[PDB]
Design an enzyme around this catalytic site. Structure first.
Site, PDB file in Angstrom:
ATOM      1  N   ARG A 183       0.805  -1.231   0.000  1.00 51.34           N
ATOM      2  CA  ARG A 183       0.000   0.000   0.000  1.00 51.34           C
ATOM      3  C   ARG A 183       0.840   1.285   0.000  1.00 51.34           C
ATOM      4  O   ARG A 183       0.539   2.241  -0.731  1.00 51.34           O
ATOM      5  CB  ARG A 183      -1.058   0.003   1.107  1.00 51.34           C
ATOM      6  CG  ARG A 183      -2.114   1.075   0.840  1.00 51.34           C
ATOM      7  CD  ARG A 183      -3.125   1.185   1.950  1.00 51.34           C
ATOM      8  NE  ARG A 183      -4.348   1.755   1.385  1.00 51.34           N
ATOM      9  CZ  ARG A 183      -4.998   2.808   1.870  1.00 51.34           C
ATOM     10  NH1 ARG A 183      -4.560   3.425   2.964  1.00 51.34           N
ATOM     11  NH2 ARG A 183      -6.097   3.234   1.248  1.00 51.34           N
TER      12      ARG A 183
ATOM     13  N   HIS B 249       0.479   4.127  -2.869  1.00 48.21           N
ATOM     14  CA  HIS B 249       0.100   5.522  -2.521  1.00 48.21           C
ATOM     15  C   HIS B 249       1.205   6.543  -2.794  1.00 48.21           C
ATOM     16  O   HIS B 249       0.925   7.700  -3.116  1.00 48.21           O
ATOM     17  CB  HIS B 249      -0.340   5.610  -1.065  1.00 48.21           C
ATOM     18  CG  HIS B 249      -1.770   5.212  -0.854  1.00 48.21           C
ATOM     19  ND1 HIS B 249      -2.557   5.750   0.140  1.00 48.21           N
ATOM     20  CD2 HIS B 249      -2.563   4.353  -1.541  1.00 48.21           C
ATOM     21  CE1 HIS B 249      -3.770   5.234   0.067  1.00 48.21           C
ATOM     22  NE2 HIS B 249      -3.800   4.375  -0.938  1.00 48.21           N
TER      23      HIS B 249
ATOM     24  N   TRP C 255     -10.403  -8.742   2.741  1.00 50.36           N
ATOM     25  CA  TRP C 255     -11.025  -9.164   1.494  1.00 50.36           C
ATOM     26  C   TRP C 255     -11.033 -10.688   1.362  1.00 50.36           C
ATOM     27  O   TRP C 255     -11.772 -11.236   0.549  1.00 50.36           O
ATOM     28  CB  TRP C 255     -10.271  -8.575   0.304  1.00 50.36           C
ATOM     29  CG  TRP C 255     -10.400  -7.094   0.165  1.00 50.36           C
ATOM     30  CD1 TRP C 255     -11.374  -6.413  -0.524  1.00 50.36           C
ATOM     31  CD2 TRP C 255      -9.526  -6.098   0.719  1.00 50.36           C
ATOM     32  NE1 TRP C 255     -11.149  -5.057  -0.447  1.00 50.36           N
ATOM     33  CE2 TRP C 255     -10.029  -4.832   0.317  1.00 50.36           C
ATOM     34  CE3 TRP C 255      -8.353  -6.151   1.502  1.00 50.36           C
ATOM     35  CZ2 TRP C 255      -9.407  -3.627   0.675  1.00 50.36           C
ATOM     36  CZ3 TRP C 255      -7.727  -4.950   1.855  1.00 50.36           C
ATOM     37  CH2 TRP C 255      -8.260  -3.703   1.446  1.00 50.36           C
TER      38      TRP C 255
END
Ligand code: HEM
EC number: 1.11.1.5
Length: 293
Positions: A47, A51, A190
């Site tokens: 991540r 980002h 998820w």
């Protein structure tokens, strides 16, 4: 007109130097195994790489991985970046041991290392990002909202020069880690594995029984009885017929997903960078397992 950012190899450094940095990241990933209820730092590193790269604007070449600007407070305090301080803190001792690596090279390499160590595809990686000053830090608000639909997702990723296949492939990274209510206003994983890179995201989208519910932050998310969730933007991938076909493809072909993810992730991490004709070839790092380490 667009800024030009030319890749410049850290002086005298070669493959072997970067493999050492990879190895230090990989060894720390193995060592610091209790973070986030034993998920480990793999997902947050992916991540962070995304980002730090995903601020790019193709129209003027602002943002992007090159400048390593997350180190500046405007960017590290972006509400969209909440929680990424954990990935940055993880990387601190790495940067201390290898002070010669640029911030952009370290953030992007952290993501590559994490994917590969979590059994994902090999991601070729190029060095030469160069730290740029604080005034080059992109403003907050360039990263995507999660409460939106397929039209939003498609349009959003056009700014990153990604097409439908590249978007669906990139979203497969949601196999990893989880949403954390205090960080994003969404809660839950998820899937089941959380720290193994597979095509589980697509299988879960297609095979689980999803219910549209409100979480404790009063935000809508899709939940399954298995204890999984999908953001509205994730679920949009099966609402849009073009996205749906690609979701089905990746759910039914692990190798194809791996290959496509690898290309799209490298592209994401390289957006905005001009590589000189005589720059070194992309590096493909060996995992710890491949090295017998
Ligand atoms: C429409 C595009 C996307 C949206 C709206 C979105 C949104 C989110 C949100 C809300 C979270 C939860 C943050 C938290 O509460 O901790 C998250 C986590 C995460 N995202 Fe995405 N994301 C998108 C695309 C991507 C892409 C392209 C990648 C990488 C290729 C990625 C990788 C990850 C990973 C690995 C996590 C888990 C982080 C952790 O467990 O700490 N995402 N994303």
């Amino acid at each position: 007109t667009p800024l030009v950012h030319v890749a410049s190899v850290e002086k005298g450094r070669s493959y072997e130097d970067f493999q050492k940095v990879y190895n230090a990241i990989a060894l720390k990933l193995r060592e610091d195994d209790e973070y986030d209820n034993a998920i480990g730092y793999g997902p947050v590193l992916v991540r962070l790489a995304w980002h730090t790269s995903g601020t790019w604007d193709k129209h003027d070449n602002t943002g992007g991985s090159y400048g390593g600007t997350y180190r500046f407070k405007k960017e590290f305090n972006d509400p969209s970046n909440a929680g990424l301080q954990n990935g940055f803190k993880f990387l601190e001792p790495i940067h201390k041991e290898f002070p010669w690596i640029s911030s952009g090279d370290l953030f992007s390499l952290g993501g590559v290392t994490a994917v590969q160590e979590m059994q994902g595809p090999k991601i070729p990686w190029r060095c030469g990002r160069v730290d740029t000053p604080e005034d080059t830090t992109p403003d907050n608000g360039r990263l995507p909202d999660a409460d939106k639909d397929a039209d939003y997702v498609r349009t959003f990723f056009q700014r990153l020069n990604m097409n439908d296949r590249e978007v669906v492939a990139l979203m497969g990274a949601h196999a990893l880690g989880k949403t954390h209510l205090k960080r994003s206003g969404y809660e839950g994983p998820w899937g089941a594995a959380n720290n193994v890179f597979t095509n589980e995201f697509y299988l879960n989208l297609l095979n689980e029984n999803w219910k549209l519910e409100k979480n404790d932050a009063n935000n809508e998310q899709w939940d399954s009885k298995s204890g999984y969730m999908m953001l509205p933007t994730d679920y949009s991938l099966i609402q849009d017929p073009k996205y749906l076909s690609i979701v089905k493809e990746y759910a039914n072909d692990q190798d194809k997903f791996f290959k496509d993810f690898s290309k799209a992730f490298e592209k994401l991490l390289e957006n905005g960078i001009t590589f000189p004709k005589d720059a070194p070839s992309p590096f493909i790092f060996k995992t710890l397992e491949e090295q017998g380490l």
